Amino acid sequence: MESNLTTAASVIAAALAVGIGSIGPGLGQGQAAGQAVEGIARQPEAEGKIRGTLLLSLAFMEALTIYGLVVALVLLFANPFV
Amino acid sequence: MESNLTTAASVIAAALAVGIGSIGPGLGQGQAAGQAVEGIARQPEAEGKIRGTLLLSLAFMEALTIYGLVVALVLLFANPFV
Amino acid sequence: MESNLTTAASVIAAALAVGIGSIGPGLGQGQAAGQAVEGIARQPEAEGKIRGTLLLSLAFMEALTIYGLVVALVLLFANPFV
Amino acid sequence: MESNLTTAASVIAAALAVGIGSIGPGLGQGQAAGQAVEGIARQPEAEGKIRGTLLLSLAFMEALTIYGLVVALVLLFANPFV
Amino acid sequence: MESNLTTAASVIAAALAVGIGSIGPGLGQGQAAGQAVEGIARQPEAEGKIRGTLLLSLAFMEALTIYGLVVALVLLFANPFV
Amino acid sequence: MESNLTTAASVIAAALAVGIGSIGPGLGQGQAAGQAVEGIARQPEAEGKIRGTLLLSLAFMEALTIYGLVVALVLLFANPFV
Amino acid sequence: MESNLTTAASVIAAALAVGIGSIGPGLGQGQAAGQAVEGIARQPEAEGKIRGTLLLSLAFMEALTIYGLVVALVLLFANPFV
Amino acid sequence: MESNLTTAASVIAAALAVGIGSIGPGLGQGQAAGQAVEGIARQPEAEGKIRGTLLLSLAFMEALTIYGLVVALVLLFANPFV
Amino acid sequence: MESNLTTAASVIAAALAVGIGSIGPGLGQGQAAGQAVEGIARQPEAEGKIRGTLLLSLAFMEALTIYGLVVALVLLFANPFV
Amino acid sequence: MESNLTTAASVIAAALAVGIGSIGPGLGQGQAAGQAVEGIARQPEAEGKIRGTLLLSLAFMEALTIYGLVVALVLLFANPFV
Amino acid sequence: MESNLTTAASVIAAALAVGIGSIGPGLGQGQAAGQAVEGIARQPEAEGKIRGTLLLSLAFMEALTIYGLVVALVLLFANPFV
Amino acid sequence: MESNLTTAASVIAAALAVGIGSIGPGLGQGQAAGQAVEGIARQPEAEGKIRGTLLLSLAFMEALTIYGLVVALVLLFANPFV
Amino acid sequence: MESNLTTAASVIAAALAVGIGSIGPGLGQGQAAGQAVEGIARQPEAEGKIRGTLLLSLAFMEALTIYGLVVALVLLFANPFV
Amino acid sequence: MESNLTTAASVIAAALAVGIGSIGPGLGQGQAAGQAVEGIARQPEAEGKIRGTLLLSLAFMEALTIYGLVVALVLLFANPFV
Amino acid sequence: MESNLTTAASVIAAALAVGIGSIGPGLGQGQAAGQAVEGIARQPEAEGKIRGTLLLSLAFMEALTIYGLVVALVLLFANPFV
């Protein structure tokens, strides 16, 4: 067990990476998904096309927060300093 | 028992990870779900397709906050420093 | 019977987790629910399908805040440090 | 009568949990309720179905703030530290 | 009579609980009530139904702020610490 | 005459309770009242119904700020500590 | 003359009570008054009814800021501490 | 001929009362006035009724800022403390 | 030439009163004026009535900032303390 | 030549007065001017009337910021303290 | 070369005057200019009238930021204190 | 191992880079993707064209956050200072 | 070389002048340019007139940020103090 | 391995440049891309022209964040001070 | 080989200039570009005129951020002080 400025900064940093990192992607995924289901209601025959394009987009957005998760996990499990 | 800068930072970090981490996904899930039920009212025959696409979307958004939860749980139950 | 930096941080953390954690889900639940009842007025025959999809959505959003509650309850009743 | 950092933090925490915890749910309940009464005006025959879905939604949103209230009451009446 | 960190924090906390606690519910009640009166103008025969659903909703929202008031009153009249 | 941390905190708290406490209710009352007078212009024969429902709603919103006023008056005229 | 932490806090508190206390009611009165004059243009025969309902509404909103004024005047002319 | 904490606080307080106190009323007066002139263009025969209702509304809103002015003038010309 | 806490506070106060005091009224005047010129374009024959109501409104809003200017000039040219 | 708390505060205050003081009037002038040119396109025969009402309005708004400038210039060229 | 609190405050003040001072006018000019070019597209024969009124308005808005520039230049090239 | 001001700043910086860096791109991707799926519903024959343009756009936006990730990874795995 | 409070203030000031100074003009230029290209699509014969008016507008807005640039360059290359 | 105020400031600076630098461009790219795919759905034959203009615009916006990246890389790999 | 207040301020300043300086231009470029591609879909024959006007606009906006880049590069490569 060690406590210093950098261990303290590391745990806070981990939380900020994943917490702040979910704001834009969370909102964005809701916007895209909302238009997708509205589109399916409008044109059910296009569901396959809509679903595929939504899935691609959700993946691009999810990755943004995953970058934050990666930084958090490095800070907690592969910390370069402490 | 143990109290130091890093234990104090850890408990605050845990709260911020899940607290802030729910803001975007919470708003986004509401946006998507709202469009989904609006679409069902418009085209009830499309309910299956709509429900399926919404569920996928809700899972992508839920995962974002779960990343915050995971950081929180690591900080409380598998803390690397303290 | 105990006051230090980490006990003080823990109580504040518990409050921030549930307090901040209800903001996005609270707003999102209202958005989804509002569209659900608008949908029911528009197409009463679809009420069952709308209600089922809404309930699923409300559960996904409620869970987000419950993650904050879980962190808060760990901090108050199973605190790892103090 | 006792005063320390943790008792002071506890009273502030109790207020923040219930205060901040009412923001999203209060706004969301107004949004849902507003669409409900607009829906009843549009289709008075669907009032029973609208009211039932509204009530379910109001409960989900009210619960979010109740989590904040629970934290506040624990901090004030079952404080684990002070 | 008595002044220390905790009495000072208690009076601030009491004000924050009711002050912040009225923001969401205040805005939400206005939104729901505005839709209610618009609905009554649109369909006066639905006034009884609209009024009843509004009353229910106003009570759910009012309760959110009353949680803030309860905390404030505990802090002022049944303070566990000071 | 006495001046200490708690007398100072009490006067500030009193102002914050009543000041912040008027923000949501003030906005909400304007929203509801605006829709009420728009409704009366649309359907003058519904004025009695609209006025009654508006009055009920204005009372619910006014009470939210009154809770803030009560806390302020307790702090200034029935202060538990100073 | 008298200068201490509490006199300094009192003058600032007085300003915040009326200053912040006018924000919501000011915006809300404008919203309501705007809809009222719009309604009069639409249905001049409804002017009496509209004016009456607006006046009631303006009074409910004005009272909110008056509560802030009362706290301010107490702090300056009937201060309980200083 | 006099400088202390309370003289410094008083001058800042005077400025905050009138400065912050003009924000909501300024915006609300513009909203009401804008709808009034739009109403007059729409229905010039109703100009008298619109103007009378606007003037009443402008007075209610102006008063809100005047409360801030009154606090400021008390602080500068009838200061209870300094 | 004198410098103390109160002279420094006085100059800042003067700037805040006039600076902050122009925000709401500036926005509100633009809103009112914009609707006025749109109204004149719609109904050129109502220009006299529109201009008269606009001028009255502009005066009410200008006065709000003038209260801020009065406070600033008192602080600079008739300071009660320094 | 001379540097003390009050000279430092005076230069900051001067900048704040004109800087902040241009925010509302800048936005408001754009709003009014945009409606003016839209109105001229709609009804070119009303150009003279529109231009005159706009000029009057622009002057009311410009004056708001000029109050900020006047304070800044007093602080720089006729400073009562330093 | 001299460095003191007031030289430091002066350079910051200069930047704030011109930086903050461009926010409202920049936004406002874009709003006015956008409506002007939309108007020209709608009625090309009114271009001369539109351009003239836009130019007048752009000048009024540009002057607001120029006041900030003047304060900045006084602070840097005709500083009353340093 | 090593803790100093710069190791502490490095972990915070890494989190800020990826955290803040995902806000704009997250929101932007959702906006573009939502329009894409709406477009596919409108014109399913354009799906290939829409998908290709969306993919290109998603990549431009994803790269923005990847710049944040690159900085974070340099700070953690190739830190020039510590 | 030279380092003191004023050199440090100068470099920060320079950045704030151009950084903050681009916010309003950047947004405003986009608004104006967007309406311009929309107008060209609507009325291609008006392109010359539209382009000319836009160019004038862009120059007025660009100048606002250039004022910030000038302050920045003075602070770096013609600093009056340091 | 070196730590001082400037190395710490450098790492924070690198993160802020790329983090903050992605906000406007990320949002702007989403807006442009969204209109592009909506346009392709409207007029599939214009896809080539739309895609070309989009790509040009995306490059202009991407460059803005790349300036932030360049600053970050200089601070990390070609630091002029430390 | 050099750390002091001004080197630390310089690196932060460089980051703020380009970081903050991209916010408005980034958003404005997206707005203009979005309208351009919408315009092209609407009127493909006007693509050349639209593209030419857009490119001119994008250059004006890009320049605003380049001013921030110039300040940053002066601070890093031609620093007048350190």
Ligand SMILES: OC[C@H]1O[C@H](O[C@H]2[C@H](O)[C@@H](O)[C@H](OCCCCC3CCCCC3)O[C@@H]2CO)[C@H](O)[C@@H](O)[C@@H]1O
């Ligand atoms: O008190 C003993 C410790 O002293 C140093 O850390 C000190 C540090 O100097 C001091 O500024 C610090 O107080 C500063 C509080 C800053 C809190 C920080 C803000 C954002 C990042 C997360 C939390 O306390 C540390 C306690 O660890 C060393 O880092 C460490 O080696 C040693 O264990």
Ligand SMILES: OC[C@H]1O[C@H](O[C@H]2[C@H](O)[C@@H](O)[C@H](OCCCCC3CCCCC3)O[C@@H]2CO)[C@H](O)[C@@H](O)[C@@H]1O
């Ligand atoms: O980090 C290691 C050290 O940390 C504590 O020391 C100090 C620490 O230096 C000091 O900055 C700290 O006060 C710093 C204020 C706490 C602010 C911080 C902000 C982020 C969220 C958590 C709260 O108090 C500790 C108690 O005295 C422990 O008491 C000490 O035993 C331990 O060695």
Ligand SMILES: OC[C@H]1O[C@H](O[C@H]2[C@H](O)[C@@H](O)[C@H](OCCCCC3CCCCC3)O[C@@H]2CO)[C@H](O)[C@@H](O)[C@@H]1O
């Ligand atoms: O173990 C904690 C110990 O911390 C104390 O040191 C410090 C310690 O930073 C803190 O209590 C106090 O500063 C605490 C200020 C920050 C409060 C914190 C902010 C966010 C998280 C919730 C509340 O000052 C003490 C000065 O003695 C003392 O060492 C001791 O009284 C106490 O037991």
Ligand SMILES: OC[C@H]1O[C@H](O[C@H]2[C@H](O)[C@@H](O)[C@H](OCCCCC3CCCCC3)O[C@@H]2CO)[C@H](O)[C@@H](O)[C@@H]1O
């Ligand atoms: O750790 C508990 C200790 O806390 C008490 O107050 C200490 C405390 O450390 C310190 O932060 C306090 O200043 C606290 C300033 C911030 C208080 C606020 C409370 C809730 C919101 C977050 C932070 O003043 C005292 C310093 O002498 C006393 O030191 C003592 O009664 C007690 O042992």
Ligand SMILES: OC[C@H]1O[C@H](O[C@H]2[C@H](O)[C@@H](O)[C@H](OCCCCC3CCCCC3)O[C@@H]2CO)[C@H](O)[C@@H](O)[C@@H]1O
């Ligand atoms: O916490 C209990 C202690 O209360 C006092 O602590 C002192 C403490 O040292 C000092 O930092 C504290 O000033 C700290 C200022 C923080 C005020 C706080 C901020 C947010 C919450 C509301 C107000 O004042 C206390 C009251 O005088 C006395 O020291 C003594 O009665 C007792 O030890």
Ligand SMILES: OC[C@H]1O[C@H](O[C@H]2[C@H](O)[C@@H](O)[C@H](OCCCCC3CCCCC3)O[C@@H]2CO)[C@H](O)[C@@H](O)[C@@H]1O
């Ligand atoms: O200076 C004498 C007084 O000392 C204490 O109060 C001290 C206190 O410790 C100290 O932190 C305080 O300075 C702290 C300033 C905090 C201002 C506070 C912020 C939010 C709440 C309203 C205002 O000054 C007090 C002056 O009364 C005791 O509270 C009081 O018994 C005693 O009269």
Ligand SMILES: OC[C@H]1O[C@H](O[C@H]2[C@H](O)[C@@H](O)[C@H](OCCCCC3CCCCC3)O[C@@H]2CO)[C@H](O)[C@@H](O)[C@@H]1O
């Ligand atoms: O509260 C009681 C005491 O208060 C004053 O003492 C101190 C006080 O302790 C100290 O914190 C205070 O500085 C505190 C900074 C003021 C901040 C405060 C924030 C809320 C709005 C009002 C301003 O200065 C006073 C002057 O020295 C009086 O000078 C003293 O005579 C009196 O006994």
Ligand SMILES: OC[C@H]1O[C@H](O[C@H]2[C@H](O)[C@@H](O)[C@H](OCCCCC3CCCCC3)O[C@@H]2CO)[C@H](O)[C@@H](O)[C@@H]1O
């Ligand atoms: O009666 C006030 C007395 O206050 C002084 O103590 C303190 C006092 O807190 C204040 O002046 C100063 O700190 C003042 C900082 C807060 C300024 C305040 C903030 C909001 C309200 C407007 C301005 O430092 C002094 C240090 O001597 C000295 O005791 C004396 O010079 C003065 O007369």
Ligand SMILES: OC[C@H]1O[C@H](O[C@H]2[C@H](O)[C@@H](O)[C@H](OCCCCC3CCCCC3)O[C@@H]2CO)[C@H](O)[C@@H](O)[C@@H]1O
């Ligand atoms: O109360 C007046 C006294 O104020 C002067 O400045 C004092 C003052 O107390 C203190 O707050 C000041 O720091 C003031 C920091 C905050 C100043 C700012 C001004 C307007 C906006 C709110 C607060 O520095 C000096 C400390 O030595 C000198 O102490 C003296 O010339 C004079 O007697």
Ligand SMILES: OC[C@H]1O[C@H](O[C@H]2[C@H](O)[C@@H](O)[C@H](OCCCCC3CCCCC3)O[C@@H]2CO)[C@H](O)[C@@H](O)[C@@H]1O
């Ligand atoms: O107020 C007059 C006094 O001016 C000086 O006060 C000192 C004072 O002690 C110190 O706290 C102060 O630093 C306080 C930093 C606050 C700077 C202020 C913040 C907002 C308004 C613009 C800038 O600096 C003053 C200038 O050196 C000198 O002490 C002396 O010339 C005289 O007594």
Ligand SMILES: OC[C@H]1O[C@H](O[C@H]2[C@H](O)[C@@H](O)[C@H](OCCCCC3CCCCC3)O[C@@H]2CO)[C@H](O)[C@@H](O)[C@@H]1O
């Ligand atoms: O250190 C020597 C200098 O001491 C004084 O200035 C001191 C001053 O008292 C002190 O509060 C100051 O530290 C206070 C830092 C406040 C920074 C300020 C915040 C907003 C306005 C721009 C920057 O450092 C100054 C250094 O010049 C005198 O102003 C000056 O005559 C003298 O050259």
Ligand SMILES: OC[C@H]1O[C@H](O[C@H]2[C@H](O)[C@@H](O)[C@H](OCCCCC3CCCCC3)O[C@@H]2CO)[C@H](O)[C@@H](O)[C@@H]1O
């Ligand atoms: O900068 C290198 C220095 O690092 C340490 O500095 C100390 C320094 O004195 C102290 O003010 C510092 O506490 C300052 C608190 C600021 C924390 C910072 C805020 C934003 C960026 C992330 C975290 O802590 C350092 C670490 O203990 C040690 O003094 C020593 O290892 C070395 O001289």
Ligand SMILES: OC[C@H]1O[C@H](O[C@H]2[C@H](O)[C@@H](O)[C@H](OCCCCC3CCCCC3)O[C@@H]2CO)[C@H](O)[C@@H](O)[C@@H]1O
């Ligand atoms: O202003 C004149 C003096 O300024 C410096 O002194 C001091 C100064 O007093 C002190 O407040 C300063 O620390 C103040 C903190 C810096 C904050 C400031 C905020 C605005 C943007 C720039 C950064 O550090 C300097 C270094 O010790 C120089 O080191 C000194 O040689 C020179 O005489």
Ligand SMILES: OC[C@H]1O[C@H](O[C@H]2[C@H](O)[C@@H](O)[C@H](OCCCCC3CCCCC3)O[C@@H]2CO)[C@H](O)[C@@H](O)[C@@H]1O
């Ligand atoms: O000027 C470089 C010096 O800086 C180091 O850290 C010093 C430094 O002056 C001080 O501000 C530091 O606290 C720094 C607190 C704020 C740090 C943060 C960093 C980036 C974002 C802006 C500000 O702690 C140390 C105090 O002992 C050490 O003093 C020394 O290793 C080195 O010579």
Ligand SMILES: OC[C@H]1O[C@H](O[C@H]2[C@H](O)[C@@H](O)[C@H](OCCCCC3CCCCC3)O[C@@H]2CO)[C@H](O)[C@@H](O)[C@@H]1O
């Ligand atoms: O020439 C700068 C000198 O400054 C130091 O004094 C001061 C100096 O204010 C600063 O480094 C440190 O405080 C720096 C705090 C502010 C950091 C600043 C904030 C915005 C701009 C970027 C970063 O503490 C030192 C205490 O020694 C020392 O005199 C010396 O270590 C250093 O060389």
